[PDB]
Structure formats: C-alpha cells, structure tokens
Subunit: 245 residues, 2 copies
C-alpha cells in the first residue's frame, strides 16, 4: 500500500498565494514512494492542475450526484474530469455537520463519482460525544457501510478516518487511538468485502496532522497516510509528505 | 434604471460548450442599454472571465459568509473578486429548497458579500401551494426583509423574483403576474427602506423566460430584466438581452 497524503486546502487561498505554495511543492524533493494530491477550492481547480507537476494529483473538495441539471452552485464529476483532476473528497465532516450532507447522499455521490471514473477519498469520523459515549466503532462502521454499499471497484477509493474532535482543533489522535480504529476498519473490510480489498485499500488519518507529529503517526502499521488541513498551506507539508523517510 | 439580464448556467457546461456559447455572446450585437452577467459554475469562473468580453459581467452562483476557513467545499467573496468576477447570486431557489439554506444564512452571506464589495443578485420566490393560499405577498416580503435588514448599501443589490413553480417547469408567470409582485416589492422598498432605493433598484424576473415570451414581460413597468436559466445556454439568450426590441 503506497503511502498517501492529500492536502485539503479547504476555503483557503488566492491565486497569488496558491501559485506560491505550488511553486514550493514543485521544486521540493518529494518521496517517490508517496502519492500526493492537493484539494484546491473549485474556483482554482483548473489553475492548480495547470501549475502543479503532473506527478502531483489534484482533487476537488466536493461534487454533486448527476452530470448536469438545475442545481445552482454545484459542480459534477464530468466538470472535474474536464479540468483534469482525478480525485474528489466526499463525506468530509464539514459537509456532514456544517452543511448537513447525510449518508444516503454521500453514498450516491460516491457511486456517481466512481462511475464517472474519478477516485474518491471518502471520509468517515465520530464526534466527541460519540467517543465519550463509547460508540466510535458503531458510528464509523455505519458510515463506511453507507460508502461500501456504493462501491463497485475499490481500486479507486481511499478511506480517510477523520474524528471530528481532531479537525482544526490541535488535538491530534494519539498514534494508538488512530491505529486501533484503522485496524478495526481494515477488519470491517475483511469481514464485509474481502481480504484482498482489506489489504490494498489505503486508510488515511486526518485531524491536526503537523510536521512535528506526523512521523510517529506514520510508523503505525495500519496508517497509510494523511489528509492534511491547515498544515497543507504551510512549508511543513513537504515534511508530512516525507513522514516515512 | 438600467435593464439587467443575468444568465444563470446552473450546473451545466464544460470548457468546449461554454467556449462555443461565450464566443457567440462576444460576437453578438447586444443592446447598449442592458447590463449582462453570466453565472458560471465555480469550476469555470476563471475561464469564463478570461474568455468573456469585458463589458459582460461574471457572477458566481453561491458563496459562503466568512473570507477564509475550514469549510470544505465552499468559496468565499475574496476568491470570487480575486478571479475578476463582480457579482454573486445568493438565495437561489434550488439552494433554499434542495440544499436547506435558510433566510438567516442567506442574510449573513449577503452582508458578507456586500462588505467585500461584490454585487449581489438576491433571490426570493414563493411556492405554488403558497400562491394558491393567497400569501405570495407575505412570503416574498418575509424573504425580502431577511435580505434588506442585512443590506447597508443598495447600489450593488439586484433583486430577483423567482416563483418556484416557474423554474425549469415551463409554467412562466404572465406579464400581469410578474408586474403585480414586482410593483408590490418596489413599494415595500419605498416604505421600509426609502424612495431613492425603490426608484433605483432593479427587480428582475426569472422562471422560464425564453426568447418567445420575453418582450411582453419586459414591457411591464416594474420588470427591470430577467435571470434566465435553461434558455441562457442557447443563442436565444441574445434575444432576451435585447428584449425591449
């Protein structure tokens, strides 16, 4: 399983500062063993695909569930593919809890994006109240069931565990907390899909991953990489990419 | 009061077909007395502003309420200005009824977009079961109030009445129907805001405007233009632009 780190740039940047960040990534020594994708805001998807070295992937931060139609403010897998991006992030906790996207809806978005030929970074995660109530395993199995049910070919899906209490707060999952649910997810996938899907699907972690804590998280056996938020806007994103080296 | 034709492409297009369309608009003999804007997918806004003639406005179909942050999937007024687009469409019916945007959110996004110096095409419109219950006027005044309370400067606001029973249905309002609620809107404005605002503010109609029914609606006294959807993807858009012709 090739190490995967995506940078989720969320609602950040302008053309000046993202051209500056992209020039850093392009000219930096980045490990050939790491798959790297940047999630630009939709308004700069085209410009990021035009400026980033081809070996770096571009992902869209959200997309809708049909190719075209009367849905003011949305964009589809067809437009993302037209601009030359190869990925879409779906199910992100901000889309679930701030904008109300349900499992049903993430689910049809996953199925439509895959049928259109994109890759899907599918995000699952429990809230703090659910972890303190002890039900982390039920919540996250329910969420990857809703995804897996819509997955035909797993070669294009990367699962991203992003516990909500760790997104943007500074309160990273410890390497043992991350490890435990990542091997439970791997277990879920072996019991419910197959052993072969379980062994090759990257499960990545997200939630306050920095240059200073990444190396200990990547040493864990079932952590296949990261989906980095705030630190992907920074010079230390190169160090996170290079966490196994 | 300058006649205003907005083109809302909704979630349609790709670079080849919007490229065909934009080339027609740049070539067309468009009226000197109309202000035109095109409302392009977020993913094609930079492309649409690069390629469209400078006299034609570009509008974003949605945005959020703060300038930057941890809101995966959103774009901000700062990013839209950065690209050169001068307007945003806020509170479109599809956003309210398919995507749950309440009047409190639309009201906070209007104030933010205006604080950032963009123009806003603020949308309002009743449902058919509300028209038949005899409460159009209380609905659209409720909606307009949620916007007006968040507007410190009206020179950059265009209001768009869009009865939801008329959007993409083909069931367009008669000129008499558009005119009754637009003169009601104007009067609401002169009594709850001011005479100079009411005199000044463009109130435009959308909901199945075609080149076939546009001269009759445009001859109505308080209809200052249109926000057209499906027909703005066709050569027909040029007729609607020129519609007092």
């Amino acid at each position: 399983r090739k190490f995967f780190v995506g940078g989720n740039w969320k609602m950040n940047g302008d053309k000046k500062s993202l051209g500056e960040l992209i020039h850093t990534l392009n000219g930096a020594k980045l490990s050939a063993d790491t798959e790297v994708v940047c999630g630009a805001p939709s308004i700069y998807l085209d410009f990021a695909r035009q400026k980033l070295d081809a070996k770096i992937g571009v992902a869209a931060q959200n997309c809708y569930k049909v190719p075209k139609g009367a849905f003011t403010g949305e964009i589809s897998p067809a437009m993302i593919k037209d601009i030359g991006a190869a990925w879409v992030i779906l199910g992100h906790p901000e889309r679930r809890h701030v904008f109300g996207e349900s499992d049903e809806l993430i689910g049809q978005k996953v199925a439509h994006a895959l049928a259109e030929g994109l890759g899907v970074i599918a995000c699952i995660g429990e809230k703090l109240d659910e972890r303190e109530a002890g039900i982390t395993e039920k919540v996250v199995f329910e969420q990857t069931k809703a995804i897996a049910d819509n997955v035909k070919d797993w070669s294009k899906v990367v699962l991203a565990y992003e516990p909500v209490w760790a997104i943007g707060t500074g309160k990273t999952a410890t390497p043992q907390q991350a490890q435990e649910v990542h091997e439970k997810l791997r277990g879920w996938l072996k019991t419910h899909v197959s052993d072969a899907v379980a062994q090759s699907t990257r499960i990545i972690y997200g939630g306050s991953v920095t240059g200073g804590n990444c190396k200990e998280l990547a040493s864990q056996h079932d952590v296949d990489g990261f989906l980095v938020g705030g630190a992907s806007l920074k010079p230390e994103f190169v160090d996170i990419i290079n966490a196994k080296h």
